[PDB]
């Protein structure tokens, strides 16, 4: 399943603009609904819960899928917030967002879901495909000379590209240098209140 | 029975039972004659009954009726029964 609902509504409740650029948000940054302008009780559980929601609606991950990402992140060496945001940053629909081929996250998900891409010459259509080190991310020859793929040819500049991946010229393809560590991760959220959420 | 080959094998089990029983019944009487001859204290008959009884235990063991260790244990008990006499 997906969410398939209003997107500004879950940025107002979480008090954080999750998509890139929104004029509906910042006219009302307070939570939606009819009791929205309240000064609410900030529980310790509320600060851990709403921090976990900030990552599910940034990346578009259901709860059972997001929990399995936590299962291996707590189980790998290093930290837990480092490795949870790493394996969320390695999903294919997030890689397409960081490379500039899509304006938002939800249009990055369809272009992977509708099968407009390859990775190692292999046709893929799964949005939670996790890329690894040295993975080329190619693109279908049918998907060239298409409107959403050529409307993102001239808009290659307004968003920055992170250091761990790289885009090239008119043969559009994305090269993964290594897995992203921490510093080149975009931060709307802290990474310790998610770890403290699953200890309850 | 139901399976066709178990009707066949029911017939061959009885023929093997009658064959094994007649051999084993004669071995009891061969030993029994030696036990009476060794109770007479003769050592004349009991020398040559021992040679014919131990020969019959060997031939039963070669026909698969008794086991070879069963022939060995019965020959050794009849031969030592003569050395006391």
């Amino acid at each position: 399943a997906r969410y398939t609902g209003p997107v500004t509504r879950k940025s107002r409740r979480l008090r954080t603009d999750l998509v890139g650029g929104d004029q509906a948000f910042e006219k009302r940054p307070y939570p939606p609904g009819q009791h929205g302008r309240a000064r609410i009780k900030e529980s310790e559980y509320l600060l851990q819960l709403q921090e976990k929601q900030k990552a599910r609606f940034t990346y578009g991950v259901m709860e059972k899928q997001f929990r399995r990402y936590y299962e291996e992140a707590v189980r790998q060496p290093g930290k837990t917030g480092e490795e949870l945001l790493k394996i969320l940053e390695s999903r294919l629909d997030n890689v397409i967002y960081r490379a500039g081929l899509a304006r938002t996250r939800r249009m990055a998900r369809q272009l992977v879901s509708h099968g407009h891409f390859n990775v190692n010459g292999v046709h893929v259509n799964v949005p939670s495909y996790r890329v690894s080190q040295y993975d080329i991310v190619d693109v279908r020859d049918k998907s060239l000379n298409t409107v959403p793929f050529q409307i993102a040819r001239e808009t290659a500049g307004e968003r920055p590209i992170p250091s761990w991946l790289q885009v090239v010229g008119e043969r559009q393809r994305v090269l993964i240098h290594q897995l992203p560590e921490r510093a080149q991760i975009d931060v709307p959220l802290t990474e310790q209140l998610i770890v403290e959420y699953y200890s309850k | 029975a139901n399976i066709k080959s178990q009707q066949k094998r029911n017939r061959t089990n009885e023929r093997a039972r009658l064959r094994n029983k007649a051999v084993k019944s004669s071995l009891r009487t061969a030993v029994r004659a030696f036990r009476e001859a060794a109770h007479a204290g003769d050592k004349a008959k009991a020398a040559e009954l021992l040679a014919s009884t131990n020969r019959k235990l060997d031939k039963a063991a070669s026909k698969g009726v008794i086991h070879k260790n069963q022939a060995a244990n019965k020959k050794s008990a009849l031969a030592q029964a003569l050395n006391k006499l």
Binding site: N120, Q133, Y134, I136, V168, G169, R173, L175 | -
Partner: protein, 113 residues
């Protein structure tokens, strides 16, 4: 009789196999005496490995191979180096290899500049 037989332990559509020395009075996926190789009939040649020094022990003591295992021993040269047939060298063939993960990755950095 001691048999050298195959043991199905893959997925539903992926029959992986192990070359195992077992008894004939034994089901397929029971206790084998010893595993002496493996056989994956899903690659493009196949993926055949026999231990080939423990295979020479079990053949020299009386283990009868089944008919797929007998074909495998003829490919690996084990049945030929046991019976004295002249084809004792291994006529098995691997797939033609792929360029590795780094070599293709650098050849895209070489082509983009």
């Amino acid at each position: 009789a001691v048999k050298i037989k195959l043991t199905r332990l893959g997925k539903i559509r992926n029959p992986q196999y192990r070359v195992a020395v077992a008894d004939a009075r034994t089901r397929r996926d029971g206790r084998a005496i010893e595993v002496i190789g493996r056989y994956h009939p899903k690659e493009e040649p196949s993926l055949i490995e026999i231990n080939s020094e423990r295979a020479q022990y079990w053949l020299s003591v009386g283990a009868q191979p089944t008919e797929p295992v007998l074909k495998l021993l003829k490919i690996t040269g084990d049945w030929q180096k046991f019976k004295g047939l002249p084809g004792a060298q291994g006529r098995l063939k691997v797939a033609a290899p792929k360029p590795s993960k780094l070599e293709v990755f650098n050849a895209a950095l070489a082509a983009a500049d």
